[PDB]
Design a protein around this ligand. Structure first.
Ligand SMILES: CCc1sc2ncnc(O[C@H](C)C(=O)O)c2c1-c1ccc2[nH]ccc2c1
Ligand SMILES: OC[C@H]1O[C@H](O[C@H]2[C@H](O)[C@@H](O)[C@@H](O)O[C@@H]2CO)[C@H](O)[C@@H](O)[C@@H]1O
Length: 514
């Protein structure tokens, strides 16, 4: 096994209090002899799944809870099992952010929400509305200042605006069926941001460091950022305030609220040490203070210490923005949702795509897994049992239905022509239970990847899946059909997502075979 036993490697993002954390790590090493290394690798949310999947990575990973459902579902997180007493030390709603399929998959640490940060010397009264910001920037430009700079390379920062007039990721009733990414609310918000850019009030290349530097150098009146940012502002001597985000179309900006959480790698041979470190050293008044004093955490999950931080008006403002926002879902396709929306915002802002085009593709990217699983699960189950599924597809499921119709039609031929091939291939393998279905995945990934990417080969891969699902039914392993469909779907979207989106997803499929 890759991960070193007898020490702890922790990953946390480089904008958080890593030095403070490492100090908590020193304390732990002092009492236990166990060294703690805190690293803040770049793109660590991307890297964790890649490396943890191969039995590697940090013992503990810090990120907002939104990425942990992906990780938990891929088996990359140890289930955590803190006792009732410990559980009572943290806010139930923070524990809620770390519950995935009924299990606690991470330790909650802090609730984070973007707030509007402003320079009180430049801007005594922060704009209440986004709509006033263009006029406000006119004024400020007259003095060689700008109104607002915030990170346009990460959709997190734009999201409160996109979500203000009705955009949403997955409707909470999480109907993963209902994606709000390209609705009129999203369009209106992202259109507003794009007009800010076209009218020179924002620059589309502005990233974290540039917005930060401009706010911290007094060049811009406002930014949008989280509590982690306040330390650098303190050091810069800007007289800043932290306040409610502006409204858009009379409605609050709805930031996606994150619970900074700490997950223990399923591959870690140091789970007990990680539980000890997180429960008894980090999630303590002193532990969270050390981290917070370095870069503020937000509203911490630990009740005792949050009662002290709650008096800080910057935290009250963070909580104000959090209550107007929504807790991020932790469902596995959050990763894809964010990747899609990131690209949409970058492209809309740079003019590479219109808002319409960009959010359409983002809707497609966001829906891709679920849409593909719906198609593939259905096809696989109707092929194995001979009977179609009676349940409707959703309100956005004309595509599913047409793609399934296409798949039936094209897939019939492909299975029929490949029956002898598939029987031989199927015979090679022992495919008798759910334990073999994960093996399949590798075989199928490897074979699928080996050749050119086109819809005909996608049909072949799904058709072999259909073949196997039939085999699984015949041997009373119908319960393995869904896992096979999930596995095929994962293979397909993880390795072909960009291609899939370029083809307009399953609409492209229908079109290619029309
Ligand atoms: C793991 C079984 C899978 S998954 C899959 N996905 C896409 N395409 C596939 O095969 C098509 C025919 C191709 O090679 O282009 C396959 C095959 C497959 C099946 C039976 C076979 N006999 C010889 C090769 C072969 C390959
Ligand atoms: O921008 C997409 C990104 O949004 C959130 O990431 C935040 C994170 O929650 C904060 O703690 C801080 O690190 O800034 C990030 C934005 O760059 C999501 O948590 C993340 O999964 C997502 O990709």
């Amino acid at each position: 096994m890759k991960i070193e036993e007898g020490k702890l490697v922790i990953w946390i993002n480089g904008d958080k209090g890593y030095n403070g954390l490492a100090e908590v790590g020193k304390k732990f090493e002092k009492d236990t002899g166990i060294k703690v290394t805190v690293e803040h690798p770049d793109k660590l949310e991307e890297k964790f799944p890649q490396v943890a999947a191969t039995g590697d990575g940090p013992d503990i990973i810090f990120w907002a809870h939104d990425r942990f459902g992906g990780y938990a579902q891929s088996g990359l997180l140890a289930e955590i099992t803190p006792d009732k007493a410990f559980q009572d030390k943290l806010y139930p709603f923070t524990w809620d952010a770390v519950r995935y399929n009924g299990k606690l998959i991470a330790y909650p640490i802090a609730v984070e929400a973007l707030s509007l940060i402003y320079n009180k010397d430049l801007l005594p009264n922060p704009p209440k509305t986004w709509e006033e910001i263009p006029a406000l920037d006119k004024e400020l430009k007259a003095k060689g200042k700008s109104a607002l700079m915030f990170n346009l390379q990460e959709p997190y920062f734009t999201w409160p605006l996109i979500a203000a007039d009705g955009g949403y990721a997955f409707k909470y009733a999480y109907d993963i069926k209902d994606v709000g990414v390209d609705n009129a609310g999203a369009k209106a918000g992202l259109t507003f941001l794009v007009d800010l850019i076209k009218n020179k009030h924002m620059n589309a290349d502005t990233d974290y460091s540039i917005a930060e530097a401009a706010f911290n150098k007094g060049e811009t009146a406002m930014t949008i950022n989280g509590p982690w940012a306040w330390s650098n502002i303190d050091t810069s001597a800007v007289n800043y305030g932290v306040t409610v985000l502006p409204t858009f179309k009379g409605q609050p900006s709805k930031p996606f609220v994150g619970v900074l959480s700490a997950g223990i790698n399923a591959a870690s041979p140091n789970k007990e040490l990680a539980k000890e470190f997180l429960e008894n050293y980090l999630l303590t008044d002193e532990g969270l203070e050390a981290v917070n004093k370095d870069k503020p955490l937000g509203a911490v999950a630990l009740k005792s210490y949050e009662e002290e931080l709650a008096k800080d008006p910057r935290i009250a403002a963070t909580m104000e923005n959090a209550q107007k926002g929504e807790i991020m879902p932790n469902i596995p396709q959050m990763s894809a949702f964010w990747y899609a929306v990131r690209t949409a915002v970058i492209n809309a802002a740079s003019g590479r795509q219109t808002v319409d085009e960009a959010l359409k593709d983002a809707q497609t990217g966001s829906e891709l897994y679920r849409q593909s699983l719906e198609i593939i699960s259905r096809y696989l189950r109707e092929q194995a049992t001979g009977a179609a599924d009676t349940a409707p597809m959703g309100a956005s499921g004309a595509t599913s239905r047409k793609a399934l119709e296409t798949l039936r039609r094209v897939g019939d031929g492909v299975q029929r022509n490949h029956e002898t091939a598939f029987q031989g291939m199927l015979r090679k393998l022992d495919i008798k239970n759910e334990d073999d279905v994960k093996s399949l995945s590798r075989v199928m990934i490897h074979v699928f990847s080996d050749g050119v990417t086109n819809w005909g080969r996608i049909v072949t891969l799904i058709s072999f899946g259909a073949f196997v699902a039939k085999h699984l039914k015949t041997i009373n392993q119908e319960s393995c059909i869904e896992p096979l469909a999930e596995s095929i779907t994962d293979v397909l979207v993880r390795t072909k997502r960009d291609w899939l989106v370029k083809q307009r997803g399953w609409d492209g499929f229908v079109e290619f075979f029309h």
